[PDB]
Design a protein around this motif. Structure first.
Motif, mmCIF file in Angstrom:
data_model
loop_
_atom_site.group_PDB
_atom_site.id
_atom_site.type_symbol
_atom_site.label_atom_id
_atom_site.label_comp_id
_atom_site.label_asym_id
_atom_site.label_seq_id
_atom_site.Cartn_x
_atom_site.Cartn_y
_atom_site.Cartn_z
ATOM 1 N N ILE A 169 34.178 15.508 37.280
ATOM 2 C CA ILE A 169 35.015 15.103 36.137
ATOM 3 C C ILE A 169 36.318 15.928 36.170
ATOM 4 O O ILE A 169 37.203 15.708 35.295
ATOM 5 C CB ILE A 169 34.212 15.200 34.824
ATOM 6 N N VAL A 170 36.516 16.825 37.166
ATOM 7 C CA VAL A 170 37.751 17.623 37.296
ATOM 8 C C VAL A 170 38.365 17.317 38.640
ATOM 9 O O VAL A 170 37.655 16.983 39.621
ATOM 10 C CB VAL A 170 37.512 19.127 37.138
ATOM 11 N N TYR A 171 39.669 17.411 38.682
ATOM 12 C CA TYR A 171 40.341 17.431 39.990
ATOM 13 C C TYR A 171 39.828 18.681 40.723
ATOM 14 O O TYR A 171 39.802 19.751 40.136
ATOM 15 C CB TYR A 171 41.850 17.487 39.790
ATOM 16 N N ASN A 214 39.995 26.128 41.781
ATOM 17 C CA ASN A 214 38.648 25.647 41.380
ATOM 18 C C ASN A 214 37.836 25.121 42.584
ATOM 19 O O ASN A 214 36.584 25.182 42.514
ATOM 20 C CB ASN A 214 38.708 24.742 40.156
ATOM 21 N N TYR A 251 32.109 20.384 37.262
ATOM 22 C CA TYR A 251 33.346 20.635 36.496
ATOM 23 C C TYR A 251 33.802 22.066 36.683
ATOM 24 O O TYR A 251 34.004 22.777 35.721
ATOM 25 C CB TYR A 251 33.154 20.300 35.019
ATOM 26 N N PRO A 252 34.009 22.544 37.940
ATOM 27 C CA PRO A 252 34.408 23.923 38.162
ATOM 28 C C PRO A 252 35.770 24.265 37.522
ATOM 29 O O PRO A 252 36.721 23.428 37.587
ATOM 30 C CB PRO A 252 34.578 24.083 39.678
ATOM 31 N N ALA A 253 35.828 25.413 36.910
ATOM 32 C CA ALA A 253 37.031 25.931 36.238
ATOM 33 C C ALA A 253 37.660 27.066 37.022
ATOM 34 O O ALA A 253 36.969 27.721 37.802
ATOM 35 C CB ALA A 253 36.697 26.370 34.846
ATOM 36 N N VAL A 254 38.942 27.331 36.755
ATOM 37 C CA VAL A 254 39.604 28.593 37.101
ATOM 38 C C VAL A 254 39.335 29.532 35.918
ATOM 39 O O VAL A 254 39.650 29.213 34.783
ATOM 40 C CB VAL A 254 41.101 28.381 37.348
ATOM 41 N N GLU A 255 38.723 30.679 36.149
ATOM 42 C CA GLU A 255 38.104 31.395 35.046
ATOM 43 C C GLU A 255 38.358 32.881 35.094
ATOM 44 O O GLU A 255 37.767 33.567 34.279
ATOM 45 C CB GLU A 255 36.646 30.994 35.007
#
Ligand SMILES: Cn1c(=O)c2c(ncn2C)n(C)c1=O
Ligand SMILES: Cn1c(=O)c2c(ncn2C)n(C)c1=O
Ligand SMILES: [Ca+2]
Ligand SMILES: [Ca+2]
Ligand SMILES: [Zn+2]
Ligand SMILES: [Zn+2]
Ligand SMILES: [Zn+2]
Ligand SMILES: [Zn+2]
Lengths: 524, 524
Positions: B318-320, B334, B514-518
């Motif tokens: 669901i994420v680029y 990400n 849905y990996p984030a930059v975190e």
């Protein structure tokens, strides 16, 4: 005058068994309330005395206890059929298990019509579902007929799992032609039964010409005329009278939630279907009303599979799940990270090109985390273990908060840090840094939040004027643990899924969990 | 003198098709190498000329390309049966799909004995597996017999998925009684065939009395006598002569990996089974050797299901998935978080009371991330998409590094920051802060790592003298992208699973990512 008795429930939310006063697990039976066995007694009594009775449900039978987890709606069809409901409107939570989990267990097994005038389907699904729910039903009542027109929250796609085929139309736009059509069929007594919340119910009463009564739900609204019988504080009189644009008085009713009350409205109609008078009140289903013995025995039989399910393995953890107060009321704790992660996962809904997901953020008071889970039972986690962590039978809800409100909440979280108080916040999609050497009220020195309106999720500073969606306990949406700012300042609040069920679903999906303490909360 | 020709492969790692020179995908066929169709030609040629031939495999056929992903070992049984292998020892990667994925496809379908003397089972599994692998086999060769005794890395539980029943015994302890027993059965020509690495092979040659030849694997060791024929640099002469404690000369052989070479050792034995002489060299399987047309046609037929699989949906995002160089060579991206998370998940193995998992940490050079994946194909991710991100056909390996080495690696990561160079590190289980205003070599101002020896994972400062397990590309374990400190200073290195297969498994398991930059990587 022709007199109709409307008996109505809404937002029963899987309270098949009698509950405590606050609609959690029944512990002292002499003070317990609700459940379908007691509701059966009271409905049967009223049907013995009153000639013209409809028993209506305004949706959200689905979701709320282990009954729904295990039986997935078969319990709703069975016990609603036993109480001989006359009609039900679809609620948002009827879509929790998708369309397939609505068609099969409920639409195919209900012996009463299920209604919604504002939901349309296309392609193969429109063929599959055709006629299994209806815009309205005309029901015989004694020697008359009453039309019942249904409606469902337009916000259902954000609040459940209906899928990308179904379209939820503006309620008033969809209702008026159906009410128009009933008039052309000589049906002059019309009830709007639906699941959009008290504010929309009042707008429907005002604007949908020909509606005589609105029976609603969703907002868990308690209305009462007189001294309230229990702890719920009324939002207005029962019925709540709306002055329609056509210049009639239209009564609007709801009956709180959780099966605690039976709504009871008496309407007198003239020969042309005009309401001459309306009066009533919800009936508190307290222990003075006996549980029907036959329904109670069926309830006890169905409970066996619940007890069996509660000790089965849902999944495994390879980490200790630190839900100790010494951790979760003082610092980031891995059980809080697990539950917030599960809360965000539960709220993944289908997205526009405009957001990766509509909500990215979670807060959870450490006061709500009541046990750790040891990983040394071969890593097994059961429902019973989760019920030790989350014992209050609450929900994880969606709210809209200004960034100023949320900054106030994080200041409250540490205002009296050091005393093992419950307001200390566990988080997801939020990174906070406190400086405890500052004055109470001025201790939040960094607060960054996970974007929604972004293709790659990343953290940005919280903005004071921006409105954020947050997943949080019902207890905090209601100002519990001193979070009065949340209750007083929230712009929107919709009830979500049962707390234990959110975590058990996530653990089941993940199979093996290993939540870390990772710097979501720091101290400078 | 009785002359035996030992032909041997090891660590073929799913290279069923001919490869490039560096054992990745074949692009210029006139420079391609290996594959089973060419190996068939060469083995057939040698069997036409030499009377006494054994064709042996020292394990790790499993794992390495889409062939294993799709066929799960059925390709190994089929093509090893077609080449008429005489025996195989179990490698670590034969346990990648658990015991069940070894029994069924390989142990039930192989037409040749599969060997390991140092693996024992208990309970129902011991009954299920009894006789499906053997400690040794005595094989007729012309008018003589040769005993072949097998062995498997004792470190298999850390390097694969054998489960908690099987026990991997010290190789030398398990081998000696089996070699003793062969002597009592009048078998005086003994080959130890096994999968523990060159260092253990030399120890077995030295210490297991009666072993005449050691044929090994695991360490991808290239031995050669003379000028090397290709790019691989020899670790020693072929054979490598060990002086045994019983005072014999025992030859030790291996043949690199990936099917690029055929090992070829000629042994002369006297009438009492003593080695009089040993000589040979691995044969480079280059394009001068034609691919057997029949095997090649079978390979092309089996490829159809691979091509079909490569465009199927593995899961959704669901994420680029930002695998752009502009991100992943300059900051946390990400796609790097996704791949490191997948690398850690791949390395969850069964644990002592002493750690939640044996490894918690990942590094990935941004130079290794070669494409983004767009989420606007209905969120679909296919194998073909992953092959664009990870196009080199490498593995994600386990190494042991001192904290000083890893601090050096993070200094290298930013030593010339700003030029879009590949050494910039993406991470998991590591939080790093750089200050680019400091001198090259002194820019790492914080470096915290996820504990292993802990029941709740949390971050602690990296310690310079402590030895950390890290998952990282084979390319970096070999000093690629300037990481010479990793190659020169690592204390242990075991090859892991194919890069694409690690990420595709994780995406399949997760279903929706849905990996984030975190904040794993920050700049001060
Ligand atoms: C601390 N606390 C309560 O005390 C509580 C509750 N729900 C009901 N009560 C009383 N929740 C969810 C909670 O966190
Ligand atoms: C940058 N890079 C390479 O250039 C490379 C490689 N494997 C082989 N090569 C050549 N890997 C994995 C890599 O990251
Ligand atoms: Ca009317
Ligand atoms: Ca001998
Ligand atoms: Zn509800
Ligand atoms: Zn609702
Ligand atoms: Zn190998
Ligand atoms: Zn190996």
């Amino acid at each position: 005058p022709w007199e109709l008795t409307i008996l109505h429930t809404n937002d029963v939310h899987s309270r098949l068994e009698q509950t405590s006063e606050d609609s959690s697990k029944c512990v002292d039976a002499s003070r317990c309330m609700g459940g379908v066995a007691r509701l059966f007694t009271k409905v049967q009594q009223i049907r013995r005395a009153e000639p013209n009775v409809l028993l209506l449900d305004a949706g959200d039978q689905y979701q709320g206890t282990i009954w729904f987890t295990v039986y997935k709606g078969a319990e709703v069809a069975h016990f609603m059929n036993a109480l001989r409901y006359d009609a039900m409107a679809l609620g948002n939570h009827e879509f929790d298990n998708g369309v397939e989990g609505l068609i099969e267990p409920l639409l195919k097994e209900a012996k009463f019509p299920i209604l919604s005038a504002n939901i349309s389907a296309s392609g193969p699904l429109a063929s599959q579902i055709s006629g299994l729910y209806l815009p309205y039903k005309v029901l015989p009542v004694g020697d008359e007929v009453v039309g019942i027109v249904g409606y469902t929250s337009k916000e259902t796609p954000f609040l459940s799992n209906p899928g990308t085929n179904l379209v939820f139309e503006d309620e008033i736009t969809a209702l008026q032609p159906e009410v128009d059509k009933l008039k052309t069929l000589n049906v002059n007594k019309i009830i709007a039964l639906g699941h959009s919340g008290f504010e929309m119910d009042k707008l429907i009463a005002q604007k949908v010409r020909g509606v005589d009564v609105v029976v609603g739900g969703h907002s868990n609204t308690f209305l009462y005329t007189g001294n309230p019988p229990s702890k719920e504080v009324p939002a207005g009189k029962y019925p709540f009278i709306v002055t329609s644009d056509d210049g009639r008085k239209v009564p609007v009713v709801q009956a709180y939630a959780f099966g605690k009350y039976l709504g009871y409205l008496k309407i007198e109609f003239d020969e042309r279907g005009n309401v001459i008078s309306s009066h009533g009140n919800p009936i508190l289903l307290d222990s003075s009303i006996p549980e029907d013995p036959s329904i109670k025995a069926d309830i006890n039989k169905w409970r066996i599979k619940l007890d069996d399910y509660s000790t089965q393995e849902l999944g495994k953890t390879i980490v200790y799940l630190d839900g100790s107060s010494q951790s979760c009321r003082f610092r980031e704790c891995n059980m809080g990270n697990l539950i917030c992660d599960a809360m965000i996962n539960n709220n993944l809904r289908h997205a526009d090109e405009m957001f990766w997901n509509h909500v990215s953020m979670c807060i959870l008071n450490g006061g709500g985390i009541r046990s750790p889970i040891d990983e040394r039972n071969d890593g097994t986690i059961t429902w019973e273990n989760l019920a030790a962590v989350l014992p209050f039978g609450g929900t994880f809800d969606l709210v809209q908060l200004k960034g100023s409100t949320l900054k106030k909440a994080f200041e409250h979280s540490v205002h009296r840090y050091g005393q093992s108080t419950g307001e200390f916040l566990q988080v997801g999609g939020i990174h906070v840094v406190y400086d405890l050497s500052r004055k109470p009220g001025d201790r939040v020195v960094k607060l960054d939040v996970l974007c929604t309106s972004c293709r790659v999720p990343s953290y940005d500073p919280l903005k004071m004027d921006e409105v954020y969606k947050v997943i949080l306990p019902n207890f905090l949406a209601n100002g519990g643990d001193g979070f009065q700012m949340i209750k007083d300042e929230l712009l929107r609040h919709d009830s979500g899924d049962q707390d234990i069920n959110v975590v058990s679903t996530y653990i089941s999906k993940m199979k093996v969990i290993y939540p870390a303490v990772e710097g979501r909360i720091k101290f400078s």
